[PDB]
Amino acid sequence: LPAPDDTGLQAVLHTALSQGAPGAMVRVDDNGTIHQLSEGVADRATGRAITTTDRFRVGSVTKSFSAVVLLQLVDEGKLDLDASVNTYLPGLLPDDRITVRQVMSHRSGLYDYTNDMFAQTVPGFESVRNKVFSYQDLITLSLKHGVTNAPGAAYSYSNTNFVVAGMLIEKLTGHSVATEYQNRIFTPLNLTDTFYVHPDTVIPGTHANGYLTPDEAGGALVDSTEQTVSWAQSAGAVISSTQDLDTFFSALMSGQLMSAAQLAQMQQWTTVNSTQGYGLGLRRRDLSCGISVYGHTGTVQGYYTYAFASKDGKRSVTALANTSNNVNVLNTMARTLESAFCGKP
Ligand SMILES: *C(=O)[C@@H](NC(=O)Cc1ccccc1)[C@@H]1N[C@@H](C(=O)O)C(C)(C)S1
């Protein structure tokens, strides 16, 4: 690979601050040489600077952790990707033909309940932040809507799919998702900054605060740091660090977390758009210099995350800006992948 471009990374972060991120940071693990940059503040009221060791909410990057657990259950013979979800969770879904593979690749047609919750950004955050939901509650919210397409027929990202994922983990293992994440991922990889504490609202240890941008342009930012994330759970509630997400996606892509057969299933790409695919709880992004990278993005209130690795896991990058509902910042932060993998233009 090209050399990571730290000047380019620095410009990305500075642009993200100019667009409304209080803080922005990135860590590259380049085959044993680290690159780490940060600009701005973890806490905008106190002025405490953001740093690449600050913990944060990774949002939908959680889906990759859920997918790893499920694919280990497939290795163990406890789950068949092409069986019906209702085989394992009887009566859950209105269509017996919706399969586990369809759920994990967002081809199930299940409606995303979060479109109900966040029609207004800050009011929706205020409605869910201190709520505790069961998995079934969230499924029932989805099922109030008809499915949006036939099973398997169309890619349509839906948090509901990884609420089903959590339910399947807990039913088939008899344990909580937190226990399964810990035993199958966090402990074996020594991810000392990585937690699943739902429904606790505290982020353990030193952390970046999250700042939710309101829908009204120019409006005051809302501190969204402390919330249950119960509206997402196995779709969105992991806490981590740039170092730990780098370790996780390098371990995944280098074949440490499941059989080769199941990693191949995880990497069967459904088209998202002309430069992106979706596997099983895994995104592919195709970069301008003809390199593809693998991992996931996250948006949870006040945090935008990108966490991606090369095909062989030897280079990994995690970038975080502590705002959300700011599409300029979201778009800017994607450029860290270009600078880190494609290098100087
Ligand atoms: C994961 O991060 C998910 N985030 C949300 O459900 C929160 C949300 C975001 C925007 C508006 C309303 C609610 C989904 N995953 C990300 C991702 O994969 O990058 C999406 C942006 C697709 S939402």
Whole-number Å distance between alpha carbons of 139 and 46: 40
User: Ligand 1 centroid vs 95 CA: distance in angstroms?
Assistant: 25
Please indicate whether residue 60, judged by its CB atom, sits closer than 6 Å to ligand 1.
yes
Pocket of ligand 1 contains residue 241 by CB under 6 Å: no
How far apart are alpha carbons 226 and 245 in whole angstroms?
Answer: 21
Cα→Cα distances 17→7, 40, 56, 89, 320, Å: 16, 7, 17, 45, 12
Rounded Cα distance, 253 and 314, in Å: 9
For residue 118 and ligand 1, the question of a CB distance below 6 A is answered with yes
**Residue for token pair 């991810």:** 191
> For residues 82 and 3, what is the distance between their CA atoms, to the nearest angstrom?
41
Confirm if 105 and 82 have CB atoms less than 8 A apart: no
Instruction: Ligand 1, residue 300: give the atom nearest the CA.
Output: 7
Q: If you ran DSSP here, which 8-state letter would residue 190 be given?
A: T
- CB-side neighbour CA atoms (13 Å) of 11: 11
Q: Which residue lies with its CA nearest to atom 11 of ligand 1? A: 118
Q: Which residues have C-beta within 8 Å of that of residue 72, sequence separation ≥ 6?
A: 184, 257, 258, 262
What is the DSSP code (8-state) at residue 236?
T
Domain ranges, ordered by start, for the chain? 1-345
What resolution, expressed in A, was reported for this entry? 1.1
Q: How far apart are CA 208 and CA 167, in angstroms?
A: 30
Long-range CB contacts for residues 264-269, cutoff 8 Å, separation at least 24? 265/71, 265/74, 265/81, 265/101, 266/67, 266/71, 267/294, 268/105
- By the 8 A CB rule, do 27 and 307 touch? no
Q: What is the DSSP string of 25-82?
A: EEEEEETTEEEEEEEEBS-TTT-PBP-TT-BEE-GGGHHHHHHHHHHHHHHTTS--TT
**CA of 286 relative to ligand 1 center, distance in Å:** 20
Alpha carbon distance 274, 282 (integer Å): 16
Q: How far is the CA of 108 from the centre of ligand 1 (A)?
A: 17
| 324 in a known ligand binding site | yes
The b-or-e profile of 287-301 (16+ CB within 10 A means b, else e) is beeebbbbbbbbbbb
DSSP 8-state symbol, 204: P
* Separation of alpha carbons 67 and 63, rounded Å: 6
289 phi and psi angles, rounded to 5 deg: -90, 15
Under CATH, to which class is 1-345 assigned? Answer: alpha beta
114 lines ligand 1 (CB under 6 A): yes
Cβ neighbourhood burial of 112 (10 Å; 0-12, 13-18, 19+)? buried
Q: Please provide the distance, in angstroms rounded to a whole number, between the alpha carbons at the two ends of the chain.
A: 13
Known active-site residue 60: yes
Question: How many CB atoms sit inside 10 A of residue 68's CB?
Answer: 25
| Cα 305 to Cα 245: distance, rounded to the nearest angstrom | 10
What are the start-end ranges of the E strands in the chain?
23-30, 33-40, 56-57, 211-212, 222-223, 239-240, 270-273, 276-278, 283-286, 292-300, 303-309, 315-321, 323-324
Q: Strand 283-286 to strand 292-300: parallel, antiparallel, or no bridges (unpaired)?
A: antiparallel
What totals of helices (H) and strands (E) does the chain contain, helices first?
12, 13
Method: X-ray
The C-alpha atoms of residue 179 and residue 188 are separated, in whole angstroms, by 13
Residue 263: HSE in the Cβ half-sphere, 13 Å Cα cutoff? 17
Per DSSP, what are the bridge partners of residue 317?
Answer: 28, 308
Bridge partner list, 318:
27, 307
Could you give the CA distance from residue 192 to residue 137 in angstroms, rounded to a whole number? 31
**Bridge partner residues of 212 (DSSP):** 222, 324
Question: Distance (Å, rounded) from C-alpha 45 to C-alpha 50?
Answer: 13
Q: Whose CA is nearest to atom 22 of ligand 1?
A: 157
CB-ligand 1 contact for 295 (6 Å cutoff): no
The answer to whether 57 is annotated as binding is: no
Compute CA 52 distance to the chain's CA centroid, rounded to the nearest angstrom: 18
Which helix H or strand E contains 252, and what residues bound it?
A: helix 242-253
In testing the pocket of ligand 1, which one of 56, 60, 155 has its CB within 8 Å of the most ligand atoms? Answer: 60
298 CB under 6 A from ligand 1?
A: yes
Question: Residues, the chain, total?
Answer: 345
Q: Mutation test of ligand 1: which of 270, 299, 301 has the most ligand atoms closer than 8 Å to its C-beta? A: 299
Rounded CA gap, 21 and 212, in Å? 10
